[PDB]
């Protein structure tokens, strides 16, 4: 009993099993949903999330880590409903997802006050329940490391030092944000092995990805199916390359699938190859078979999906 | 009839009576309240709002216009509870309050889609209730007129053209944002007299304030009690000067009081004269007595608090 689970007793990290480290049951903008509930259907969202999780479990997924936090519409009671319907081990997190500035609430507030919110969710529970957070999620993207983005990073480091939960990040693979997150966190005393630098699979710049892995953090090849960021074939070649080059013990793989997401849909792009179905199981249908074909053995798969998450949460 | 009221049948605009055009029963950041409910106490908030409204009614206020919208924590059911407890005429609005970018929901979405949300609230109702919006609120501040800020302004113009409800703005008195809002709205076909340009009382630059009034819009001397923006004495002198200069028929006065607000507390500033009590009734205690004793007659008061709101909502 060391990793808290939604709707269940906590488990030992050694028992996490086959894990999807970055998937979302549901994402929404809190303010839009509060103000215009007519745009949403929680029953449909629930059905969709339950079906996705069930499909993941039939491929052998034991645990799903869901980094939906403030800014992405975290709802612990929705998450509980999915657990009740499926029996999945679900790890919820705390944190703040922003690209530029914090909400107005945080005007005249300290990094310590921010960290206290995270620690509340880890030690006391999330949204008035006894379901506790098992990691912290932070973000940076195109705007880079702004002052408020940096405040949140520093607050995450405080929470990690106090509670030992790991940190998952969102970064932009093309502007060094991930490298900066890793640097700031490690400067503040976070173990590099307690950090997953996200969305590195969005680039085929292997020198950049290795640089981060070499500094001791997990690398998030974590958006399989999101072709608009990087097509599955190029992701697969990069993943294969990294495996070939000895990086299995730093690689984490996921889809960043949002079973439902409320953002406007971007212009389709059509390529010669039929578009992969983005879902929580695309890796079982495409990536893993591809790897196996190219001689990747079962031990690599176990390393990426079992041993790495076990270490991350240890 | 014509102006929709929370928890009541609509009223004719001629029957609006003595109005406070810009007051907030409660403000909060939607995402923070959803994620960390431990920080908030709705029962305390309700008590505080009810007491403030009762005190306003004791001074003869008939109608309060509350421009809490998306970004400020609009909650129509909370508003209904205040009406039930007090009997106030309360005008709720729709709109979006942002300074830089829209929520992620709006990625890949059109100005028309944004306007449709406003029109839904005006024609159908707010948050799943039959309480309808009676105006649109928009904002700009230190970052100026960004592309997303402009989208929201243009969406407000569409909603006004379709429904004839007026537009209230938030601006920064020191960087031309109010002038820009007025210009863009009027260019899009909004009657200048259907616009209240907010927070002009935050400056003593009378030339700037008059410029906006001369272009046909109401001018919001609307933050009485917020000394950190401009002290009450200086506001009073500016208000008096505008009256002396013949601007009564463009002046709107309010406090922008937030009966509760969740933002961190700014550093105190202490001045030689005791700080006035920022509340929903400060103008009865300070401003109005000051005006009358400097020779301002009852007809000016009636113009500012009754006739101007009547015209605005006509
Ligand atoms: Co992300
Ligand atoms: Co304002
Ligand atoms: Fe994600
Ligand atoms: Fe306001």
Residue numbers in the entry:
A (entry chain B), B (entry chain A): 1 to 314
Paper text:
Phosphotriesterase-like Lactonases (PLLs) are appealing candidates, being natural lactonases endowed with promiscuous phosphotriesterase activity. PTEs and PLLs belong to the amidohydrolase superfamily, and share the same (β/α)8 barrel topology. SsoPox exhibits high acyl-homoserine lactones and oxo-lactones hydrolysis abilities, and promiscuous, low phosphotriesterase activity. SsoPox is a very appealing candidate for the bioremediation of phosphotriesters because of its unique thermal stability, and its ability to resist aging, solvent and protease treatments.
Of them, the most active variants, αsA1 (C258L-I261F-W263A), αsA6 (F46L-C258A-W263M-I280T), αsB5 (V27A-I76T-Y97W-Y99F-L130P-L226V), αsC6 (L72I-Y99F-I122L-L228M-F229S-W263L), and αsD6 (V27A-Y97W-L228M-W263M) were subject to kinetic and structural characterization. Although the active sites of the improved variant structures superpose well onto the wt-structure, all selected mutants display altered loop 8 conformations. Notably, mutant αsA6 was crystallized in two different conformations: one in which loop 8 adopts a wt-like conformation, referred to as closed conformation (CC), and another one where loop 8 is unfolded, referred to as open conformation (OC). Interestingly, variants αsA6 and αsC6 exhibit enhanced lactonase activity against γ- and δ-lactones, while αsA1, αsB5 and αsD6 show reduced lactonase catalytic efficiencies. This emphasizes the fact that the improvement of the phosphotriesterase activity does not necessarily compromise the cognate, lactonase activity of the enzyme.
